[PDB]
């Protein structure tokens, strides 16, 4: 009779719960499980953050989960309550689909990994494009919020560790007329513009840029995924280039990979000596799981080469490395794939890029 080790999950639907169950059952078949055997415990998202925290305690931590998978629901309901409550005990949380850069901040989310990269890592792709297409002078426009500034910090680090940013302009989120900001950019010589902004803020940029004739021949526009989604797509200038994270919204694929990674890590953990069990339930328990920080290290340094979503490793913030992106180009008002970033390398496909104007 093996020791039973529970893995937890907070997921979007009962379908995804069943996918989690089966992934864990496969992990048990795959692995040698005479000593250690995994058991799936799951719920779906509660309708508010306090209920959600309570359910993490009552439904998951009561089962002594060693880790918790969390999906981003596609309805205001974030992983955050689950990170907080699990983090209180140093139980690792694995985000499956959340892209916001704030989850990279160890001070707030002190035991959080994810199998997708934060939006800010799209800078890694921009940088490779800047080398490839020899854009040696760029203007960077970002929203003056956490996400925007995270994109800036990431690109600047790549540029300061070749191509240069001739200027960085920040704007206040929710500003509707941005003519003043963009006139500043228009004055400059560089004509490659990079944008980090939410949907609605991208929309405002695109509109103002159009009225200043900054979306036609001569200009290049390089953006991420939010800036070619929803309403941002509706006013985007032709010739724009943006990104889509491949499998980025496939909860099922990330459940598979996450379980594989966590199963591998748990079997590795139990090679070592003096592994303790997590706390059973929240009530009366205020000490951290003594083994939590070690299990975090083992996860951080996990490699899973043959993932559904590609090559799975994590960086020093616990963020996905070797993520793969579609490189999209708006031609005749259709988003067309003109290549991919395969995790380390740009691959142009046989569809031609059409730039602003031509």
């Amino acid at each position: 009779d093996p020791k039973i080790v529970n893995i937890g999950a907070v997921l979007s639907t009962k379908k995804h719960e069943q996918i989690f169950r089966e992934a864990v059952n496969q992990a048990n078949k795959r692995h040698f499980t005479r000593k250690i055997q995994l058991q799936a415990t799951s719920v779906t998202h509660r309708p508010n953050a306090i209920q959600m925290a309570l359910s993490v305690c009552e439904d998951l931590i009561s089962s002594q989960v060693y880790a918790i998978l969390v999906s981003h629901p596609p309805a205001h309901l974030t992983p955050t309550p689950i990170s907080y409550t699990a983090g209180f005990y140093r139980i690792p949380v694995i985000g499956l689909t959340t892209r916001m850069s704030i989850y990279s901040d160890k001070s707030i989310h002190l035991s959080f990994l994810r199998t997708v990269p934060p939006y800010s890592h799209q800078a890694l792709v921009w940088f490779e494009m800047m080398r490839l297409f020899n854009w040696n002078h760029v203007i960077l426009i970002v929203s003056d919020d956490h996400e925007g500034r995270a994109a800036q910090k990431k690109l600047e680090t790549l540029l300061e560790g070749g191509p240069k940013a001739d200027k960085v302009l920040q704007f206040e989120p929710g500003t509707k007329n941005l003519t003043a900001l963009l006139l500043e950019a228009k004055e400059l010589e560089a004509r490659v513009i990079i944008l980090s902004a939410s949907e609605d803020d991208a929309t405002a940029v695109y509109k103002s840029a159009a009225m200043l004739d900054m979306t036609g021949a001569g200009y290049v526009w390089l953006v991420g995924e939010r800036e070619i989604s929803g309403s941002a797509l509706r006013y985007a200038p032709d010739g724009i280039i943006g990104l889509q994270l491949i499998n980025g919204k496939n909860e099922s694929a990330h459940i598979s990979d996450a379980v594989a990674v966590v199963a591998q890590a748990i079997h590795e953990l139990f090679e070592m000596e003096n592994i303790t069990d997590p706390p059973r339930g929240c009530v009366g328990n205020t000490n951290i799981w003594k083994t939590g920080p070690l299990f975090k290290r083992v996860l951080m340094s996990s490699k899973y080469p043959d993932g559904v979503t590609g090559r799975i490793e994590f960086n020093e913030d616990g963020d996905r490395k070797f993520a793969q992106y579609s490189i999209m180009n708006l031609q005749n008002r259709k988003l067309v794939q003109v290549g991919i970033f395969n995790g380390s390398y740009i691959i142009q496909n046989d569809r031609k890029i059409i730039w602003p104007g031509g």
């Binding site: 309708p47 953050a49 306090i50 925290a53 001070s107 002190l110 929240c282 205020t286 975090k296």
Partner: protein
Amino acid sequence: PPSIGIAVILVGTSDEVAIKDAHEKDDFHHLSVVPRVELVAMNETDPKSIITRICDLMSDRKIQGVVFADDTDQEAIAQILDFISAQTLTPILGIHGGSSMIMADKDESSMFFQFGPSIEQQASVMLNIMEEYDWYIFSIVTTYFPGYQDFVNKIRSTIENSFVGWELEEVLLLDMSLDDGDSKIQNQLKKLQSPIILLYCTKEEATYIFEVANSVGLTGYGYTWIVPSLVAGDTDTVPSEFPTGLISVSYDEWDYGLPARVRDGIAIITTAASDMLSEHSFIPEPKSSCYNTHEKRIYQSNMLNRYLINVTFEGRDLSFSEDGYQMHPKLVIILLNKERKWERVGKWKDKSLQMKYYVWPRM
């Protein structure tokens, strides 16, 4: 005058009788509104116990505000309270214990306010101490505990804007979210040269860090460590790892006792409610449910904050900052002496430092 509900939640042994006494200035609310106070005892300080207790209170009764005190060193309690405050939009005052330990970056929607000093004020009290004794050469150690950036920034801002010959030699950032089986933290601490070390972290973190620092010879004579209030925490609980000669800034219940704190808490919430009622002819309706907050949210706000931060009572300024700290706390400088007892060795009062010793006796 109409009555507003205020829960006073007390964790761990306390004189309820002595507490109910200091509030006999209950005949001392001549405001537009009077407090209906309910003492509530709590045993546990995990997230579930704290959430369910407060939510049960809020459902059983109409609570305008919560006054919270505990007898622990658990700084996570403040984090839990900020979360509850922001989610339910209910005023919560953390007046003692873990609940008062600095919580940096409170939520935008938070109505959570803490007795005791901001991070930046403690940073500056530290530099004033160092200046008094002409200790101009120092290094900083922090963990990733929230605030560590504000701490390092404040130090750096202060010293770069002064003509005193400050020398900040080394800033270490220790990651204690991972295990220390590779002796990483030992290797980082071995870098330290300075005769003064400022340490920002939690009391539990400092316990491990000092253990390591001892092993590599960093805690004896020649090294003076200075820490903020939350590291000393409850001064009747002194980890064996803490080195004698440790200096701390403190607001652990020296001259400002729990009874007086509870009374000031009740006054702050009550005055704020009266002030708002006087100006707007309403106050926010107490949430009847934690569990419905998603619906009810366009109907709620943190309006009461404007008033919560600007109360004077019995001719004493009880102002909070917008960051949610006491404005003008009287701070006590304490030293861990040879008997492993914390000892008063100075005061910070009227933005001025008054130290007991001109020269430090041996410790």
